[PDB]
Amino acid sequence: DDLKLPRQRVDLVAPPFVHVHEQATKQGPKIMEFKLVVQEKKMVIDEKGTTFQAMTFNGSMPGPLMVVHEGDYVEVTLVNPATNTMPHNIDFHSATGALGGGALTLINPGEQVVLRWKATRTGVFVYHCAPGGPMIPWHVVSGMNGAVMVLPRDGLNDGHGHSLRYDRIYYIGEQDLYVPRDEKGNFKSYDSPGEAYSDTEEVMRKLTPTHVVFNGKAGALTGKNALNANVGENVLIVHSQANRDSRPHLIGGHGDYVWETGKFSNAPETGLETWFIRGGSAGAALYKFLQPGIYAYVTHNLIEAANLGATAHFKVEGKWNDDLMTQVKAPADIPTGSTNE
Amino acid sequence: DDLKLPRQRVDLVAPPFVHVHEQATKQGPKIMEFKLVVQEKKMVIDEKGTTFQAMTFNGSMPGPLMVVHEGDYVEVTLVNPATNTMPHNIDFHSATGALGGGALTLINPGEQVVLRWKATRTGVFVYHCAPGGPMIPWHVVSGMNGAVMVLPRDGLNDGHGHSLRYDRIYYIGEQDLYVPRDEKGNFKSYDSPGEAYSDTEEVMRKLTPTHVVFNGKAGALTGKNALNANVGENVLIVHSQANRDSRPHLIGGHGDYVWETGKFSNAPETGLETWFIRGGSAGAALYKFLQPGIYAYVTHNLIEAANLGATAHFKVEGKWNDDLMTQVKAPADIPTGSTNE
């Protein structure tokens, strides 16, 4: 064993939640140990019950958020159980060399592999499967993508010498899906990913998704699964898109501090309405809630948001601030003496 | 009346022009009073006379630019005359709470509502209708979107302690439209927005506009309606797109100072060729004209610019500067002694 550092095992949690971590740390570098198990399975992706043949890390779309600190080593055990049908691997955009690790991690069903990469670059980054050739886009748009956050050891800052600390963190993975339709326009079902491939590839080629979803399905983060917050809390929202651009917006809020390219060596932008996640990247926004109520978090192509699945909700508890906004007069009949031309 | 500030009524003007305002001000905060009247009407959107069932604020696409200063309060009377067929509301991306105001402003035909929001965030911002669900994209891509500018009280600056002042301002609202076609490819006409909806939604779902226009129609800002300027003038060009990305470019010019994310707390970028307006945002560019003549202002997807409607012109008066550019030799026959392989 050449590398003589303490080891720490991390238990991942399903998105949009994030495993326990420290923001700032005075611990030295560690070997941070993670396990990812590939799971191919049929999943429900919309509110009408449409299914499709997904491929996942750890059973979720997105794959879980991994969080480490600058200078840590990340030792990932990737497992491809023999119930799976395809080979898989992993490419970390946070890592240096061998196609992000993909060239060192190709495993057949029944195999596992252990990759270590040094976390030399701060930010949020995509990770994704990339077996080779046309299998690269297919595995990614089938769900095989997640993100990793590499925090500075002193935690986040505003790029102007002031520390920033979040009260809460959520990870929003956005997924573009390409579900085949029959001649009548109904979504087609298949018994395996391999059977779905040819028809799926034809949809992929036209670069227009059938669905754009957060946390793996339309409505996943609405209703009973809305994201909780409180007035006053500084919330970090990490957003990834491994294949296609997105334009996040918090309806009724702002991005107080936004790293749209997602890299903490760059000062954030302030007071954004809408930001831009380039396909193949993660970004992050901090917002301090000022008002209670429901907020919609969307990609601000509103067709994608409302009609293809890409809306989440926050439910924020606290007291309303009438100075920031008030209904001066409730809806009422237009006065008879009005002229409205 | 809890809020004891002076009130000022603003008369809006149709785009691309902007109502009278001060850049820098020493007045304290005011309650700035605006009126927006929803108008559903058939409108001509291209040079072949194609019509479509539009929905507007104040009869225009885009809706008018509102201009206030940081710390002002904005009291908006939204009116939905009883000649309209649908409910409408308004979401200000500049505002904090209640989905930007949409949750406090839903009005049926025959009603009006009064919303007040504090202008706490500087920049240019979209405002748009957002009734709920699939009606959100439909009302926005039918034309119900505009912008508001919240200036710093000291006016604009270059992010490096130098004041910037514009001689002229224009507001370019870009609109993506989704007009149904019949089996022969001809655009379909309808008698009401409700009748157009189902067919329109089908076009919307494929995320490919039929038209991309400035100021509501192909050719709106060309010919006799070209934008005027003079050599030496510093012109602010505000650009909004409430649903879809755009990439503005001034052909023959530059962006001297560009806030592509549109927020004045961030230093502008300098000397851009082309900039990027993320769907769901406004941005702004300053340019000091150096040469007279015709300039085309486009989105630099040139197919959209030339073939789907997204070109404006500036006509700039003044004297040509042969140091910056000259025709050394006019077109002439290729010399006989030339080799051109």
Next chain:
Amino acid sequence: DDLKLPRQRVDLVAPPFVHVHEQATKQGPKIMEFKLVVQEKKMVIDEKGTTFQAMTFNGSMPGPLMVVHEGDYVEVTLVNPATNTMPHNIDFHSATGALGGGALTLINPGEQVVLRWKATRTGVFVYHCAPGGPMIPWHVVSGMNGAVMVLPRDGLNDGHGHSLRYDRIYYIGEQDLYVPRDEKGNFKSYDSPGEAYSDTEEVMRKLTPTHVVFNGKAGALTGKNALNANVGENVLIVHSQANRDSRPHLIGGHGDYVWETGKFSNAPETGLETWFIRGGSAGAALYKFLQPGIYAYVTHNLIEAANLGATAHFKVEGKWNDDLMTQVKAPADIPTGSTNE
């Protein structure tokens, strides 16, 4: 002759290579003389041998990279040989006035023209043909676009007072193509550009390319034409896209310093995973290679990368650094005592 500066003739080279130049210079301003010869010709654009009716500067897609310094004058002789069928011109996004030069450079087959523009703006910039109207997008998506780099006279810097110097430079021109298909889905062939136009325009209108290629064809920069580098070298990668957005990513690497909007008066961003070239612009990234092996350089819409042609390779010589990344355990059977749920 009013302009009394030394003249220097530059011999252009085919992309992805770049003509000999100095980074930093103490020479004063010069008149830098370039020749571009339009060539319309059928070209092979994919690995199955698909052809299409291309239009080029100097016989290549992209056109060659021109490199000058701030304050130089650029005197371009544009030649349209009489074997061509169409008029052509040139618009420099680096230039000020007359639609970038397009309004001074329209030439019929059999003619040439000489344009001079002052290089007042630093950065990488697109140049492209723009005859007028619908011919603008058609000539650009037929291949008539390249880039020019205007270096500061002191060479590049990190925006924080430190000089940056590249060991190598490559120019990656990305081209979106719109090749017609017949009723069976096979790509159609034509005998001239004029014959291809009507069918091509119909594909263009739907804003979905059939191919997205680097250096004019799928596979152009893979295999024997991979880009060479060595561990330790700082490589500048200039990327242009004259019509459509792109999201470059170096698989297994990063962008150490990235000017995504492409203009050297703005500090670069650091440590990017993926960056964004807005359609109608050039950008640039510096990366110091740290690991040997194969790197893929893609647009990170992976469908475009793997299935529509947009992948290049770097082959990097040197010694592997096991500290940055190592395969701890090669692929092996999942242990019997494992639980992987």
